[PDB]
Curated annotation (Swiss-Prot):
Domain of life: Eukaryota
Gene this protein is translated from: VMA5
The UniProt record lists the keyword ATP-binding: yes
Pfam families: V-ATPase_C (PF03223)
GO terms, biological process: endosomal lumen acidification; Golgi lumen acidification; proton transmembrane transport; vacuolar acidification
Bilayer disposition of the protein: Peripheral membrane protein
Assembly: V-ATPase is a heteromultimeric enzyme composed of a peripheral catalytic V1 complex (components A to H) attached to an integral membrane V0 proton pore complex (components: a, c, c', c'', d, e, f and VOA1). Interacts directly with VMA4.
Entry keyword set: Acetylation, ATP-binding, Hydrogen ion transport, Ion transport, Membrane, Nucleotide-binding, Transport, Vacuole
Function: Subunit of the V1 complex of vacuolar(H+)-ATPase (V-ATPase), a multisubunit enzyme composed of a peripheral complex (V1) that hydrolyzes ATP and a membrane integral complex (V0) that translocates protons. V-ATPase is responsible for acidifying and maintaining the pH of intracellular compartments. Subunit C is necessary for the assembly of the catalytic sector of the enzyme and is likely to have a specific function in its catalytic activity. Reversibly leaves the enzyme after glucose depletion, causing the catalytic subcomplex V1 to detach from the V0 section.
InterPro entries named in the record: ATPase_V1-cplx_csu, Vac_ATP_synth_c_sf
Organism: Saccharomyces cerevisiae (strain ATCC 204508 / S288c) (Baker's yeast)
Name recorded for this polypeptide: V-type proton ATPase subunit C
Length: 364
C-alpha cells in the first residue's frame, strides 16, 4: 500500500472569494468548507521580492518552472539513494526531518532564509544563486554515489571469489603452506577436487595417473556437500600427464601455485574492498542526508519565488496575495483540486475552462 503525501501551494488576490460559497470568508472556507473541512491549511509566508524589471517577469516564470522541476528531480534521486541504503522508507514516510522537525511541520512554518539568500537581490540573481547551489549539491551526491558504486563493484568481485563448490571456489583461505611441496626445483603439489562419489576411485587410482606420483602422498584437505579436495605430490615434469589423466577420470585439478605473496594479496583484496565499501557507505549516507535537507529547503525557496512571480503575472501589482499551503488527505487530491477550481477558476477569466489560477501540486 502506497499512501500519497501531497501538498498544494495556492495564491489568490487578497480579496478573492469562492464563487461556490457566496458570503463565506475565504480563510474560513479553506478550513471549514473545502473538501468538507478535511484539508489541513496553513499560511505560507513569502517575501516581497525585488522585481528587477516588469519586462523580465515572463522569462523568470519560465526559468523558475525549469529549476523547480530540476530540483524536484534531484530530490527524487537523493531519496532513491537513501532508500537503497535503508536510511528511509518507501510506501510511507519518504522524507527526512528538516531542521529537526518533520516535513509537514517545516512546511507549516516556512520562512525565507534572509541571511543566506539576501532579499536585496533581484529575482533574477536569486534564481541563479539558489539554482547553482542546488546543482552543486546534486553533483556532489552523484560523485560520491558513483564512487560508492565503484567500491561495491570491487567488493562484489572479491566476494564472488569465495563462492561456489570446491571445484570452482578460490582456495586461498582454505589451504596451508604445509599442504604443499614448496621451493623444490623438481617436485610440486597438485590439488584435485573430487566428486564425493568418486572419492574411492581417486584414492585407488591417483598413484598411477602419471609417472612419478609420490606414493601415499594424497590427503583430504577440505570437503563440502559435493566434493573432497585432495593434495597430491609429484614430479613437476609429470604434472601435464597427471592433470590430463585426472580430467579424463572426471576429477577436477585446481591450479594453485602457493606463495605467501599470492595468499597475502588475495586476503588484502577482500579486506581492503570491504573497508573501502564501508567507508564510502558511511560517507554517502552522511552526504545524502545533509544534501537532502539543503536541497529540500532550496526547493521551497524556488517555489516561493515561483508562486510570487506567477501571482504578479496573473493578479497584477501591488503584490497583495493570500498564500496557503494545503496538506491534502490521501485519496482526495483530485477532489481538492476540482473544488479549488470551481471556487476560484474565475480568476483565470471565463474563457479559460495551465491551472486557471496560481496553484502547484507537490508530491511528497
Amino acid at each position: 500500500l502506497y499512501t500519497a503525501n501531497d501538498f498544494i501551494l495556492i495564491s489568490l488576490p487578497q480579496n478573492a472569494q469562492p464563487v461556490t460559497a457566496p458570503g463565506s470568508k475565504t480563510d474560513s472556507w479553506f478550513n471549514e468548507t473545502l473538501i468538507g473541512g478535511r484539508a489541513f491549511v496553513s499560511d505560507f509566508k513569502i517575501p516581497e521580492f525585488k522585481i528587477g524589471s516588469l519586462d523580465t517577469l515572463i522569462v523568470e516564470s519560465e526559468e523558475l518552472s525549469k529549476v523547480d522541476n530540476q530540483i524536484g528531480a534531484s530530490i527524487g534521486k537523493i531519496i532513491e539513494i537513501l532508500q537503497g541504503l535503508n536510511e528511509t522508507s518507501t510506501n510511507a514516510y519518504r522524507t527526512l526531518p528538516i531542521n529537526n522537525m518533520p516535513v509537514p511541520e517545516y512546511l507549516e512554518n516556512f520562512q525565507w532564509q534572509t541571511r543566506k539568500f539576501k532579499l536585496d537581490k533581484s529575482i533574477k540573481d536569486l534564481i541563479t544563486l539558489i539554482s547553482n547551489e542546488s546543482s552543486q549539491l546534486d553533483a556532489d551526491v552523484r560523485a560520491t554515489y558513483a564512487n560508492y558504486n565503484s567500491a561495491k563493484t570491487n567488493l562484489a568481485a572479491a566476494e564472488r571469489k569465495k563462492t561456489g563448490d570446491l571445484s570452482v571456489r578460490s582456495l586461498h583461505d582454505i589451504v596451508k603452506p604445509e599442504d604443499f611441496v614448496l621451493n623444490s626445483e623438481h617436485l610440486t603439489t597438485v590439488l584435485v577436487a573430487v566428486p564425493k562419489s568418486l572419492k574411492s576411485d581417486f584414492e585407488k587410482s591417483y598413484e598411477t595417473l602419471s609417472k612419478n606420483v609420490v606414493p601415499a602422498s594424497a590427503s583430504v584437505i577440505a570437503e563440502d556437500a559435493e566434493y573432497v579436495l585432495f593434495n597430491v605430490h609429484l614430479f613437476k615434469k609429470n604434472v601435464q600427464e597427471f592433470t590430463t589423466a585426472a580430467r579424463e577420470k572426471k576429477f577436477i585439478p585446481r591450479e594453485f601455485n602457493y606463495s605467501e605473496e599470492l595468499i597475502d594479496q588475495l586476503k588484502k583484496e577482500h579486506d581492503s574492498a570491504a573497508s573501502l565499501e564501508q567507508s564510502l557507505r558511511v560517507q554517502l549516507v552522511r552526504l545524502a542526508k545533509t544534501a537532502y535537507v539543503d536541497v529540500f529547503i532550496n526547493w521551497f525557496h524556488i517555489k516561493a519565488l515561483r508562486v510570487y512571480v506567477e501571482s504578479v503575472l496573473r493578479y497584477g501589482l501591488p503584490p497583495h496575495f493570500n498564500i496557503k499551503i494545503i496538506a491534502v488527505p490521501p485519496k482526495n487530491l483530485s477532489k481538492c483540486k476540482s473544488e479549488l477550481i470551481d471556487a476560484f477558476g474565475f480568476l483565470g477569466g471565463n474563457a479559460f475552462m495551465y491551472e486557471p489560477f496560481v496553484m502547484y501540486i507537490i508530491n511528497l
